[PDB]
Design a protein around this ligand. Structure first.
Ligand SMILES: Cc1cccn2c(=O)c(-c3cc(Cl)cc(Cl)c3)c([O-])[n+](Cc3cnc(Cl)s3)c12
Ligand SMILES: Cc1cccn2c(=O)c(-c3cc(Cl)cc(Cl)c3)c([O-])[n+](Cc3cnc(Cl)s3)c12
Ligand SMILES: Cc1cccn2c(=O)c(-c3cc(Cl)cc(Cl)c3)c([O-])[n+](Cc3cnc(Cl)s3)c12
Ligand SMILES: Cc1cccn2c(=O)c(-c3cc(Cl)cc(Cl)c3)c([O-])[n+](Cc3cnc(Cl)s3)c12
Ligand SMILES: Cc1cccn2c(=O)c(-c3cc(Cl)cc(Cl)c3)c([O-])[n+](Cc3cnc(Cl)s3)c12
Lengths: 197, 198, 199, 196, 200
């Protein structure tokens, strides 16, 4: 089997609209790497950031034997199921800056790392101090509760040319629940502690 | 039945372009806005930029399945379902949907759609910097379906603490509009956001 | 016949790319703007940003069905229908459609499309801050269909009370343009919005 | 044959991705508006009708007993890959993306375009005015595949612009690149304009 | 064989989603930027807006045809062929392609793609209003294909009407690797040394 055969197989087997549960939730790993802080407004409490959203999960149906073939291919995400992640305090659409390609590994692991520019409503107070501001970004599945999707977290790539610098990034698991229903929604709370240089 | 079987059944039965009227009764659409943010307010132009969750529910009993030994809910892309053609009458920008365009379908045939929307409105911003605050009225209804086809029924907890504004009161009242040409009435929800600068 | 049957039949007979000329008659397109808002006015650059409902009606008799014992109207996405290729000649932005892109089809074959449009125009903004106000003229017609293929016919109630501007008068007059090349005439409606800044 | 039959036939015969061979493409700009001029950055924002004609004989039909012209979406036709070499924004097509096809196989496409250009704005606030040169040609087809031929410059120009047109000149030209022997044909449109 | 036949054959054999690796060799992608214009420079935010031609070439031997008695080159929409998934690592906007999205395919299987791109970068703008000027570094490589799948090789048209002038452009090969994995990603580092015209 050559690359074309693996890709043909993935396209004919992929169910983009069907969460690939093995009765277990799909374990989605999410890690933000901050690349840039572009605009900060201490009056409106708004930030414009660029981050790589490292996103991994498993779809065992996509797996193939790679003893005598490539163990990884690039696949357009429009061909694959993708977690329906959203940032709860986003105030703009995520602008994906990068090619919308995922990597599929022969064991069925899927890796997606879009570079995203997005605006958030978060605490910008203290940005011009030594201690800096702490902007909290909550990312979770919009429509899949904890029995369907679990979200697990895990300044190296931050631009030296930003007016801001990063003091600390903290990535903590959290859970939200609504008055209506017993369903809990898992999220990652990403705490970006940063300040003006 | 697994998730794929429920979704294939929904795909084969759902007619995205056909309102699911039972007999000649209207489809009862529930609409509830939850305000998340007030981003830009202009007291001179009377324009406000808001973020809200538009909780939208209705019934398509043709989609129903037995969930005794199966999942009782799935996520479905809205392009596979009929969705109410709701619009805000006093919007001055396109709705920016911030969230994945998936609905939930429940085994009893309930459909639930909760987009997070950023949109700009023309409304009364006068008094925003006072104690009594401003009252901004948002009218949401079906653009093309009169009251015999769609009825719209209404029903601070999630408001960002980091907004420059705070919410005093949200009221959701049912209302109805009619045009000189025709006897048809269009139902809407009038959402009254009473808010002020902190 | 139920709504699904009417919609199936419309999709089978509708030719979105084919003007529905009955005999070899022009398709009579009715156009009526209802101004909802005036957002930005620049008296120096002579530019206005407006919101209007473009009430647009025409006949496609091939879509007709018997509506004794069926619904006499349905909502249909405009991507399933032929739609007039109307353009504003002094527009300087693309029309931003604010509303769902659904038309109403009546069982006699009448089609009604009422998009809410935000668009920017180049027009006369002089006098906006006076009592007599400015008169901004918007020219709307078919871009590619001359008068033997499309005729365009015209016909403050919904204006936002919260605008900084107020409407004194709207006039809708039929007009016709012809180009040096060809004998073909293009019909338009000239919509004259007389408005001013409030006291 | 009725309109539906002409359009059905165009869908069966048209190859949007195949140049209908050089194809002689006629290009003529009519300036409608000058919106923004910046003397410091040498940038202009203009609105123009790009009158574009060519022949695709494969589209032809007998019109003795049918319409001799139809409107066709450009996504159904081959269209010249014309670009402005000194554009600094994407062309914003303001108008419905329909061409006219004549029964002899002539195609006419007249988009109204808003676009920003890098060009000489020096003298704009003088009596002699500025001369802004806009170079339009095929991006990927050299002169053996596409030839570009030009055709009252102020007849359609908005009276409400802060600017006025003194002269529009449309001259044939050619570009060639260090790599290759191929020549690319262009029209150089010289817009002589000034502040009122 | 006429143009229609060549294009039909390209559509029948081209796999837009499949990198055309020959044996187990990487696809050699040649990338060369020609700067056309510098539009907006912000010395406070360290942001530039530039227009450049991204000359992109590679080989897809599956596309090849006999051109002894037919055209040796055609224009093909990029949606009909595989295209390298190049991205600028310090881009802060989507690339805005200003030009028709057509590649040239040569009968030997050579593919040439030259989009005119407007894009905003985060890079060092300090010194732009000095004699030595600013050096803005743009890193371009494959987003998803490591060095065993794609290799990136580097290899006059600047508007005379820009308020900036170009002192030097240097194009150097480089390689990145991530803590997770052994895979290396090739890039080109393009160094644009430029400054404001007309300083005293
Ligand atoms: C090539 C590249 C440029 C920038 C960021 N990348 C990354 O961050 C990672 C990465 C991912 C994880 Cl889960 C952990 C770590 Cl430590 C690194 C990575 O593999 N790649 C290549 C890829 C691009 N798209 C996909 Cl899918 S994989 C890059
Ligand atoms: C996960 C999440 C984030 C934000 C808002 N949501 C909500 O408001 C509700 C919700 C809906 C109703 Cl009708 C009543 C109540 Cl009390 C709550 C909800 O279920 N969910 C998940 C969903 C997202 N899209 C669909 Cl469809 S369901 C969330
Ligand atoms: C519900 C609604 C909100 C706003 C404007 N509308 C209108 O102006 C008219 C209308 C149309 C005409 Cl031809 C004459 C008159 Cl007097 C009124 C109308 O019927 N509707 C509903 C519709 C929306 N889209 C279509 Cl198609 S019909 C509304
Ligand atoms: C109706 C209209 C509004 C604006 C500009 N138009 C034009 O300039 C010309 C035109 C074209 C040429 Cl080649 C020479 C001359 Cl002298 C005039 C024209 O025929 N039309 C209609 C058309 C629009 N799109 C197509 Cl295709 S044909 C108009
Ligand atoms: C016509 C044109 C306008 C602008 C730029 N172009 C170029 O830069 C080059 C070019 C390419 C290389 Cl690899 C080296 C050199 Cl030295 C020049 C070129 O051939 N062409 C035509 C083409 C445009 N798109 C394709 Cl595909 S071929 C132009």
């Amino acid at each position: 089997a050559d690359r074309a055969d693996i890709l043909y197989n993935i396209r004919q087997t992929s169910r983009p609209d069907v969460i690939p549960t093995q009765d277990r939730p799909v374990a989605v790993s999410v890690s933000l790497k901050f690349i840039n802080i572009l605009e900060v407004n201490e009056i409106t409490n708004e930030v414009d950031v660029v981050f790589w959203q490292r996103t991994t999960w498993s779809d065992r149906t996509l797996a193939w034997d790679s003893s005598h073939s490539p163990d990884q291919v690039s696949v357009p995400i429009s061909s694959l199921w993708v977690p329906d992640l959203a940032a709860y305090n986003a105030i703009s659409k995520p602008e994906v800056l990068t090619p919308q390609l995922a990597r599929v590994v022969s064991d069925g692991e899927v890796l997606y790392v879009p570079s995203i520019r997005q605006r958030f409503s978060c605490d910008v107070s203290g940005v011009d101090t030594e201690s800096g501001a702490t902007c909290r970004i909550k990312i979770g599945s919009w429509t899949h509760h904890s029995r369907e999707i679990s979200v697990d977290p895990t300044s190296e790539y931050f631009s030296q040319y930003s007016r801001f610098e990063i003091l600390d990034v903290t990535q903590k698991k959290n859970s939200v629940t609504y008055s209506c229903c017993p369903e809990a929604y898992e999220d990652v709370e990403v705490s970006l502690n940063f300040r003006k240089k």
